[PDB]
Amino acid sequence: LSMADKAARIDAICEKARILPVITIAREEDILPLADALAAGGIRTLEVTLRSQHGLKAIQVLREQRPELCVGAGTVLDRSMFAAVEAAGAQFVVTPGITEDILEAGVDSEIPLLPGISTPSEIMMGYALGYRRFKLFPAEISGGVAAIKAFGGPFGDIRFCPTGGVNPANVRNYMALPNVMCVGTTWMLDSSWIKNGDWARIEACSAEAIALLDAN
Amino acid sequence: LSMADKAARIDAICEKARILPVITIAREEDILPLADALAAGGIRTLEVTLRSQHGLKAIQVLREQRPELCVGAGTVLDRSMFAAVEAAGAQFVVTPGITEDILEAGVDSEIPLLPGISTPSEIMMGYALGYRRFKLFPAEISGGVAAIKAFGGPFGDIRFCPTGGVNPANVRNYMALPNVMCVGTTWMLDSSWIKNGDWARIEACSAEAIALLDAN
Amino acid sequence: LSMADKAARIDAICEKARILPVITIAREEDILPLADALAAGGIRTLEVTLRSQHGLKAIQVLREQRPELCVGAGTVLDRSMFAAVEAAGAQFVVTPGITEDILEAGVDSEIPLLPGISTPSEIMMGYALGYRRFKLFPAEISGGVAAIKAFGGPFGDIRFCPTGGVNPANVRNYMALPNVMCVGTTWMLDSSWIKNGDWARIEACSAEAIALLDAN
């Protein structure tokens, strides 16, 4: 309900997740198997994007049949879509960027919103409305680790979730920063793997991603 | 008249153009000769910037004497300038970036507007008002080809026109992407060439730019 | 009072400064000694950030005891903070990014504001309200020298103050550009130096920074 509460809630969700998979469901029959593969590998928090028609149905199925998993919605481009996912049962909302509307929509919503930003001005726009937890997108192109450090100076009280360009080669560098909650990506969700139903490959890849984070 | 119509119109203009030259007229007597040089080289769509006083006069002269060429205006920084170029006869408008005003100005205008963006948040700001065709500026600094690909994920239904840093060495890489309508630049409009009236050099350079695009 | 006046005033302040040190006071007893060290090295214009509690007190002490120095405030994230620093005695205000509020706050304020921007859209947002002097942040990540040159094309009548990534290795490259007023940084304000009170090291470093700018 309170802005400071959503900041804490979204913070709890991201720390327990560690790695936020950006899922795009192309086929209905892929919801559960995909979800079980990730879950077995240690990834219990999912981000289902509205990048496909099956977006909403997926959130619903997962919220009724896999209640143990924490499922959020992504690629919400307007207040209309924001309202939809909220009814579908999403536990949190994620966006690629911000607008005045969306930011106010997250202030009135019951579930927390992790807005996506790229620049200091965009951070301030959400800072003013009480946002303290942001998603950096695209991570690499925006300046990656160097950017996160730069923003830490003027905005020392905000945490980030870099997404876009994050992979096994740079995943620890990001997680090393004290102001990074978790990272997001799709490197364990290879397209070919999903089609051919190679769920053992996905399960193995998720396990590797989680095992990669354990030291600093 | 309709937003979806302008999206299509601006899309038609950019596909037939392939290469959008960003022109800045420093001398009146350069309008036609410059225009004929480009036109002979295969470049029939021009973007006259308001970066100089001769901006408006150029659009007018070209619209009355070279009706066969498709001429648009660029570097429109406010609703006032937007209104001016529209009266001057510009067939479309281009901007380096976006503001709330400008975006609404393009919704009320009769001629289509290709707004310039750099980040996902900026894309969304125009997406909300019905824009589906954007100009990436500055292309190279914003992430070039990698950026275009990144934006394709969340915004898979929008096309781009990269400008800034585009040259013969990277022009095909951009044109290879399915979500790139055309590219813009000034590499065939060398300053020295214009002054000394070396129109043969410009004509040859335009021909080379068009010939460079033919395979993928 | 007039927008065009603040543009000139802020321009005067930045040219006489050459190098704008971004200060963060961690201890009260560091105000004067730090200020005298910089001043002796040739740096008479300071930017005290509100990144710490001692921000406001510092501006006050410096405005009453070191009236010969030109002191401004930084890291002003809202209209509330903007009003505070103005009462504290700041001679100018600086921000890491922009918002609609802040930009209007600088239009009503008596002291000039140097807003921080990263992209063309952000520049336009402030351009519309009459701003012609901007701070590029983060300089390096935003495109550094190449970015400054790119923005010079469409916005040929604005000057910049790059901050973030500026150091002895690239400081002259920036100062060479005709549309750069000055640069900002913290490379002469090493943390360890401040704690251990190594003011001779700071004084020597400031002198070196000023001596580095003399040729182009």
Side-chain angles (χ1 to χ4, degrees), chain B residues 3 6 18 28 34 47 56 64 72 93 107 117 123 144 168-169 204:
Chain B
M3 280 310 277
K6 297 170 174 175
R18 308 175 78 170
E28 332 69 45
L34 176 61
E47 192 216 299
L56 286 166
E64 67 179 68
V93 182
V107 183
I117 64 83
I123 287 174

Side-chain angles (χ1 to χ4, degrees), chain C residues 1-48:
Chain C
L1 191 73
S2 164
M3 280 310 277
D5 290 328
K6 297 170 174 175
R9 202 185 193 191
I10 193 64
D11 192 63
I13 304 178
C14 282
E15 300 216 301
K16 300 181 182 176
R18 308 175 78 170
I19 293 179
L20 202 56
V22 186
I23 308 170
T24 298
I25 306 301
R27 288 182 218 65
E28 332 69 45
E29 38 144 42
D30 293 351
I31 313 289
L32 302 181
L34 176 61
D36 294 341
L38 293 172
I43 292 186
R44 276 83 183 197
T45 300
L46 315 175
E47 192 216 299
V48 185

Side-chain angles (χ1 to χ4, degrees), chain A residues 119-121 124 127 142 146-147 153, chain C residues 51 75 77 96-99 102 122 141:
Chain A
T119 75
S121 283
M124 287 175 80
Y127 183 88
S142 300
Chain C
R51 302 182 190 187
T75 309
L77 310 182
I98 64 164
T99 59
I102 281 176
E122 294 173 356
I141 283 166

Side-chain angles (χ1 to χ4, degrees), chain C residues 1-2 10 16 18 23-24 44 49 67 78 86 89 101 103 117 130 132 139 151 161 166 169 176 180 188 202 210:
Chain C
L1 191 73
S2 164
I10 193 64
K16 300 181 182 176
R18 308 175 78 170
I23 308 170
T24 298
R44 276 83 183 197
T49 76
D78 55 62
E86 195 161 4
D101 282 357
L103 289 185
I117 64 83
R132 301 295 129 99
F151 302 149
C161 166
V166 184
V180 167
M188 11 65 192
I202 294 173
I210 292 297

Side-chain angles (χ1 to χ4, degrees), chain A residues 63-84:
Chain A
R63 288 297 288 142
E64 67 179 68
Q65 293 175 50
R66 290 296 121 89
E68 69 282 26
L69 298 176
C70 185
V71 185
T75 309
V76 165
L77 310 182
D78 55 62
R79 71 304 159 184
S80 187
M81 288 177 209
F82 196 115

Side-chain angles (χ1 to χ4, degrees), chain A residues 6-184 186-204:
Chain A
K6 297 170 174 175
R9 202 185 193 191
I10 193 64
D11 192 63
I13 304 178
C14 282
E15 300 216 301
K16 300 181 182 176
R18 308 175 78 170
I19 293 179
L20 202 56
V22 186
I23 308 170
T24 298
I25 306 301
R27 288 182 218 65
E28 332 69 45
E29 38 144 42
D30 293 351
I31 313 289
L32 302 181
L34 176 61
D36 294 341
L38 293 172
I43 292 186
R44 276 83 183 197
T45 300
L46 315 175
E47 192 216 299
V48 185
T49 76
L50 283 175
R51 302 182 190 187
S52 67
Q53 313 170 173
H54 309 299
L56 286 166
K57 182 216 161 185
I59 294 168
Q60 293 185 60
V61 172
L62 289 171
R63 288 297 288 142
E64 67 179 68
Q65 293 175 50
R66 290 296 121 89
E68 69 282 26
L69 298 176
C70 185
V71 185
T75 309
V76 165
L77 310 182
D78 55 62
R79 71 304 159 184
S80 187
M81 288 177 209
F82 196 115
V85 295
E86 195 161 4
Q91 286 168 284
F92 64 99
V93 182
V94 180
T95 59
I98 64 164
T99 59
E100 193 44 46
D101 282 357
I102 281 176
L103 289 185
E104 299 181 312
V107 183
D108 309 325
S109 72
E110 223 70 69
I111 63 178
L113 164 71
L114 184 67
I117 64 83
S118 183
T119 75
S121 283
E122 294 173 356
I123 287 174
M124 287 175 80
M125 291 178 44
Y127 183 88
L129 288 181
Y131 291 83
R132 301 295 129 99
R133 263 60 190 168
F134 301 91
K135 163 181 174 167
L136 182 62
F137 176 70
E140 281 297 300
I141 283 166
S142 300
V145 183
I148 300 282
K149 292 186 184 171
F151 302 149
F155 320 103
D157 67 314
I158 63 176
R159 305 293 190 63
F160 300 98
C161 166
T163 286
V166 184
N167 58 60
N170 57 42
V171 64
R172 315 186 80 263
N173 298 314
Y174 279 107
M175 288 301 273
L177 305 177
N179 60 329
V180 167
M181 305 183 271
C182 54
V183 292
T186 62
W187 79 86
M188 11 65 192
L189 302 158
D190 188 302
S191 307
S192 313
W193 291 354
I194 300 179
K195 307 172 187 173
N196 308 312
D198 300 314
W199 301 301
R201 260 57 48 165
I202 294 173
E203 197 285 316

